[PDB]
Design a protein around this ligand. Structure first.
Ligand code: GTP
Ligand code: GTP
Ligand code: GSP
Ligand code: GSP
Lengths: 422, 426, 426, 422
């Protein structure tokens, strides 16, 4: 026995946390109130037939928190773990990092500290947020360094909604993205991808949902986190811990930004049309378009590859499929990283939702790597930042939060050094 | 939560605010008296932003009515939905500045500033959290501009952190309704560059031509102008008032629209706008709107953005569609309008969607954009001011209210610096 | 227990006391005759404070009616609730001082002092324990002020330990109803600095303006003034009359309001005060009252506290709310009104709540505060007295009743010392 | 066999005594009249199935006594133990100490002396009152010195309603507070905290009662006194006496003002949401906001810590939790007091009321210490006294009771010496 803590900041973070808790509740049979020992990794035993999520819901705006506390799962969540803000940063990293974040970071730090107090087997921290959101950038970053300074070497996992190259809710998104990336770089143990446009494209072409909604995105995150945490929440042939995830993909602290991909995303009518075998599902998932990242991995080199099989998957078939994956030349690896393969097998089949886009299947695989194509996105973001900051636009907004342009500039050069480190 | 207090100045401003209030009563399911009858919880869940907690299951608008004459007062109160306002919010003068900025700002504004500050402070304190303000007035008029300037000054010195927008009505360049209206615009802009966080410029002749041609009406009236104004109204404020997959508020727009403190003038937008025998034949799809987002026909404040360059664009949508189509449409808009767009502000389209469409339309689209086209309007205003200030005509009315020469000189210098900065951006 | 005897002087005082008595009959469930019909035990449990044990299941007010003329006598007795008073409490003169202090205090007061002392002693002895007294009169009037001075002197020499309050009516500065009213105010205050433990100053024009603007009445009358007076009435005395989570009495208020024996003048307060078409739209919450606690609009005795400094504030509440909201509201009131407040009297807000709200209102709030604003009123009175005493005009009427020059000199010297001490506090 | 005597003075004292007797009656099953051997610590065996409280109800005003003698518990209380006054001091210490207190102290002294006569195992005295109340200050003080001179070294426990820094019924509260504190300092064996504002805040945030009433406060006192007296009224692994309480926390007679705190304060719906384990409940109780005192203990040092567990609490778990409490640096102690820990274990679970805010639970802990943060409140009260006495306001009220200003001044310097003794 062991536990983990999930952190949700901003609208995207709150929605993601709610969806993930919906998964964890329906997978273990939790009714909306909390009733009917691996489920203790995310829920706490007190009283009689009771469980509550080990999470904190915080946002500078109370709209999403109000929406959460109006669902049928009010009884499921403790009221005190929901935090309501008053002044949304409005896509401003500095606003949510200094003006409102500094006076509300205390209660959250403080009581996630108790969440660790009753969880002596705290494996790590889960963070869900968005770069585009000013709250989800600033408050998330500051609480990230607060976690680092209050826990030391404790493992921490970040799930960030990176704005897409052509999808941006706010035009000031480069400022928030660059600022948060420079601020939390040294402490970000592992940060993933989310490309909204790639999610929409995959849903429209794979699930063939011409009119999807953010619920599809919500379980897109939900299924990813479920596949990641199945090892901790269910036994398997070779379970994988959170520590090994950062051990394999962080030989150097500078590069800790791996991309994620799921296989498969198939509707029930199309699930009738295809049953999964290891070779086909892996080679489909390794296909660049199947990746939920809008960056072709074949442009650069591959760091490492991690497989997360769940269900009735034969390890020998895994080895054979992975080998025949290796031999083909569409896949290339760095010279000094010949053997960077880790496989995690779990016996728990992926869980379905009623009325969901995904089809109920006994087996699945999670696609886990850190390709060099992320450098393309980083360079494009840096170029956009240079263009839109060259005339110094929207800077006065961050100035009114009380800093001058210097920190913007050296964050730009820090991220440039990160980009050229490849 | 995030309460917004409405203050209306001038006859046009009072009419606009009233029409807004009936439109909000439609959108939130409020009858002519104040009772709620909406069929969905979404209308009444966030009714507190524009309404207050009234006894007997009622709701009253969070509005402040200010004028120097009670003529439009009586017409508005005796008009439709006049009983939804308490008599206390109606505070009026008895002299009238007579389309004079100095009179309405110093002579008659001296005995109205106390009342307007008292009522706005009462509205602010009686609410939970005042997110911001919204003011409507006409820069062509003299009194309304003076009330706008006085209120923005008092708000800035009282609530420097609470942002707002001002929906001022700039006088039409083609028609000189008032001889001394250049002074009014001069002083109003000189106070707006200084006491307002962001401003939308609403020009008459552009909406007149839209009603004439796009709507295909042979008899345009103030009613249609107030209707389109209320559509702009709802389009900007629906993200805060109604739940959305991409939630937004006035603070988000202000952050996304203001690159420099003095560069805060934007030109609002609405679409689709089609008649009965075109709507049943037009495509009710996004491309029909994206061809309508960028055009000098359905264009709001009479200065063509094609001559200048767009600063950045904000687009709010209300309906049932996916988001990726919007993103690719915005990308295509950049791809084809690159020359009309700015090269050094990549992805300058602000994309957000409110889930709930307005009453009677399953889409509405509000085009919030900024371009250096307003440079032409400001330069023409400056040259007109120079033209009839070189002759020193009609200065006696202002100098009789405690005016001075070099004051107007630094006013015109401020607009000169503003237009020079806008040209430098161009 | 803690019985209070009411004595009314002058026509205005008699009307005020009567209106009080009907209001108490409402609050305690007493009909026009005296029978009890209240629906709760709380009304009738402490009825003995203002009523006496009457045979046949009846109750009569503990009131004393004094006048020098029977005109208002007959109107009051023949008016509503006139049968609830025994004929013995009605004692009247037959001459009338004619708005003269000296006449009503020496000439006609000589043959009324015996009667008033006899009746007050009968009321005191017939009761269990007389907690204190309450008197109503007008300082503008001559006779009423003389009866007030005589009764406070006799009470002080007879019951020096039993505190009281006097609800005197200071003449309005704007209107000179009586030419010799400055003499009346002079002598009344000279006796009040000396025979009264604490006094509330009630000024006409302030309540007139409140009825005109705050209540929005085009025809203010004495009835509304007496109504608000009876609200002040109930607000002060509800803590003693009715059970409360924070029980209080007149002794508590006197201890909390009097820092120096000569510094005992306070300016009462009532809220909320809203009309039919504002009450159904206003917020029936504490913040709507705390914005109404401190204002020159709903303000009682016509001198602005903003110019001066508050000494200390007492706030009594009647309704259904928790107490911490009141405490934090008082803390915010200090935080924002620190300049208007006194720095060397920390936490100068006296907080108490009576559980039982008045009939017809689920909150009423009575603002008992003290400020150096009354310094302006006293200084203006002193300078007026100097102005028309330098000319020695209208002195013959007083000197014909046994008056003298340096007596008025030490009177004006006493007000000079009082105003100097108040300025020193400021 | 043994007994104890409870003393109630003023409105607050009378209400507190009534609530405590309500607890003692419902815990032992006493019907309002007195029927159906540890219950003899507070009730006396005479006749048949009879018990009466060993208490005296006295107040300068008869309102609260009349309210008590109109409840359904008229038969429960002897009529002769209720004392009715005629002239309330009205928040004046001198009035209730000299004018009315001196002529009614005799009967109470006199007949509490009989209450000791039939109670040969008198463990100590319990005193409940309020500093703000003039009666609860003056009469309580004078009877305190009368107890000291008529009993010598007999243990005496005081429960005082100290007015909060921003909550004061009377503006003349500094006078009464300073006067009573200087008067009873030498004889006050042990005096506690009550902060009304802190009680309201905790009830609103922990019990989530948006509209609480003084009944919540009444059992706030009731549960505190019950947890204190459970050792005397019920056996346990290591029972604690009244003498040891003053032995541990009074090495020097000057400092005998410890603060009190309860754990937990949780409603039934929230009790479904949390079951108690030793580590979590103790660390929550040690949190400054959980304390019912409006003074952050982390400002100064800690004197000593006493635990009062009741119910099925394991001593080994107690030791482990207390140790892991010690190691953390949020808790600090004085250099010359390294081992100041006393633990009292009782097997009686805390008792619930029907219709009460607290939830019915088999285990509880009482938080008992004397932090240095009380010096902050004392200094603030002294500063307010200096401000509001500098111009000599409301002094004439105490003058009319027949003393000059000198005693006020030297009480101020006595309390200043107490403040600087830290
Ligand atoms: N993938 C995904 N992203 C979402 C979802 N909801 C919101 N987002 C992200 O949120 C961004 C919009 O801004 P928010 O993060 O909501 O900003 P906010 O919550 O208002 O916080 P502030 O900007 O500080 O006021 C978009 O760019 C999205 O990337 C969702 O359901 N799915
Ligand atoms: N915590 C708590 N305190 C109370 C309660 N009831 C009264 N008090 C205290 O009592 C104070 C009010 O004054 P009282 O103690 O009642 O004074 P009194 O009973 O009238 O006695 P005198 O002042 O001498 O006339 C308040 O400041 C409270 O602190 C209660 O139910 N709970
Ligand atoms: N769109 C629109 N414009 C209006 C409306 N009413 C007036 N206007 C425009 O406003 C301008 C006049 O502004 P106005 O507010 O009437 O000046 P004013 O200073 O307040 O006039 P006065 O009160 O001193 S007499 C005119 O050019 C007119 O076209 C209206 O209802 N809708
Ligand atoms: N608020 C209020 N004021 C009143 C009322 N009646 C009279 N007054 C005020 O009292 C003042 C006169 O006081 P008054 O009591 O009539 O003098 P008086 O000396 O008793 O008059 P007289 O008996 O010698 S003839 C006037 O200024 C008037 O405004 C009343 O019913 N309500």
């Amino acid at each position: 026995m062991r536990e983990c803590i999930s952190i949700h900041v901003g609208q995207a973070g709150v929605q993601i946390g709610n969806a993930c808790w919906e998964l964890y509740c329906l997978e273990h049979g939790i009714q909306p109130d909390g009733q009917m020992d691996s489920f203790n990794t995310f829920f706490s035993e007190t009283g009689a037939g009771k469980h509550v999520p080990r999470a904190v819901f915080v946002d500078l705006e109370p709209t999403v928190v109000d929406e959460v506390r109006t669902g049928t799962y009010r009884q499921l969540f403790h009221p005190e773990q929901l935090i309501t803000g008053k002044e949304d940063a409005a896509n401003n990293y500095a606003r949510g990092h200094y003006t409102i974040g500094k006076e509300i970071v205390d209660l959250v730090l403080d009581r996630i500290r108790k969440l660790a107090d009753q969880c002596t087997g705290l494996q790590g921290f889960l963070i869900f947020h968005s770069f585009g959101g000013g709250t989800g950038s600033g408050f998330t970053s500051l609480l990230m360094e607060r976690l680092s300074v209050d826990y030391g070497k404790k493992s921490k996992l970040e799930f960030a909604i990176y704005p897409a190259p052509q999808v941006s809710t706010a035009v000031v998104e480069p400022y928030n993205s660059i600022l948060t990336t420079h601020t939390t770089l040294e402490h970000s143990d592992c940060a993933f991808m989310v490309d909204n446009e790639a999610i929409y494209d995959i849903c429209r072409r794979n699930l063939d949902i011409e009119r999807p909604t953010y619920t599809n995105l919500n379980r897109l995150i939900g299924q990813i986190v479920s596949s990641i945490t199945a090892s901790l929440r269910f036994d398997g042939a070779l379970n994988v811990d959170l520590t090994e995830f950062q051990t394999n993909l962080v030989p150097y602290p500078r590069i800790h930004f791996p991309l994620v991909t799921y296989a498969p995303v198939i509707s029930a009518e199309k699930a009738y049309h295809e049953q999964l075998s290891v070779a086909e599902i892996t080679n489909a998932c390794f296909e660049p378009a199947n990746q939920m990242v809008k960056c072709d991995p074949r442009h650069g080199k591959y760091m490492a590859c991690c497989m997360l099989y769940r269900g009735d998957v034969v390890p020998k078939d895994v080895n054979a499929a992975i080998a025949t994956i290796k031999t083909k030349r569409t896949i290339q690896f760095v010279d000094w990283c010949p053997t960077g393969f880790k496989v995690g097998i779990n016996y728990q089949p992926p869980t379905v939702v009623p009325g969901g886009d995904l089809a109920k299947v006994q087996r699945a695989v999670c696609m886990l790597s850190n390709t060099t194509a992320i450098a393309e996105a980083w360079a494009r973001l840096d170029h956009k930042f240079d263009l839109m900051y060259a005339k110094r636009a929207f800077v006065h907004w961050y100035v009114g939060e009380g800093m001058e342009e210097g920190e913007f500039s050296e964050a730009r050069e820090d991220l440039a050094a990160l980009e050229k480190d490849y | 939560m995030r309460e917004i207090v409405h203050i209306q100045a001038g006859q046009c401003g009072n009419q606009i605010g009233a029409k807004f209030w009936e439109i909000i009563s439609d959108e939130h399911g409020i009858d002519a008296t104040g009772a709620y009858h909406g069929d969905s919880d979404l209308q009444l869940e966030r009714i507190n932003v524009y309404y207050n907690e009234a006894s007997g299951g009622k709701y009253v608008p969070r509005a402040v009515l200010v004028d120097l004459e009670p003529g439009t007062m009586d017409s508005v109160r005796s008009g439709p939905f006049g009983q939804i306002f308490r008599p206390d919010n109606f505070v009026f003068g008895q002299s009238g500045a007579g389309n004079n900025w100095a009179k309405g700002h110093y002579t008659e504004g001296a005995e109205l500033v106390d009342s307007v500050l008292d009522v706005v402070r009462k509205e602010a304190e009686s609410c939970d959290c005042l997110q911001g303000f919204q003011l409507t007035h006409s820069l062509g008029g003299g009194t309304g501009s003076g009330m706008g300037t006085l209120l923005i000054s008092k708000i800035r010195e009282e609530y420097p952190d609470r942002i707002m927008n001002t929906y001022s009505v700039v006088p039409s360049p083609k028609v000189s309704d008032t001889v001394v209206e250049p002074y009014n615009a001069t002083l109003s802009v000189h106070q707006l560059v200084e006491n307002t966080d962001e401003t939308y410029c609403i020009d008459n002749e552009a909406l007149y031509d839209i009603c004439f041609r796009t709507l295909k009406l042979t008899t345009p009236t103030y009613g249609d102008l107030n209707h389109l104004v209320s559509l702009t109204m709802s389009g900007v404020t629906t993200c805060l008032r109604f739940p959305g997959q991409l939630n937004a508020d006035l603070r988000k727009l202000a952050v996304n629209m203001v690159p420099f403190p003095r560069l805060h003038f934007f030109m609002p937008g609405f679409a689709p706008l089609t008649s009965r025998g075109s709507q049943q034949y037009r495509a009710l799809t996004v491309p029909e709107l994206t061809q309508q987002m960028f055009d000098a026909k359905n264009m709001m404040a009479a200065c063509d953005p094609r001559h200048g360059r767009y600063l950045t664009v904000a687009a709010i949508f209300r309906g049932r569609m996916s988001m990726k189509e919007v993103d690719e449409q915005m990308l295509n808009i950049q791809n084809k309008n690159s020359s009309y767009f700015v090269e050094w502000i990549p992805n300058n389209v602000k994309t957000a969607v409110c889930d709930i469409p307005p009453r009677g339309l399953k889409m509405s689209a509000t085009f919030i954009g900024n371009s250096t086209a307003i440079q032409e309007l400001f330069k023409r205003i400056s040259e007109q001011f120079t033209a009839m200030f070189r002759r020193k005509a009609f200065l006696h009315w202002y100098t009789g209210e405690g005016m001075d020469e070099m004051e107007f000189t630094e006013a015109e210098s401020n607009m000169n610096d503003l237009v020079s900065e806008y040209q430098q951006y161009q």
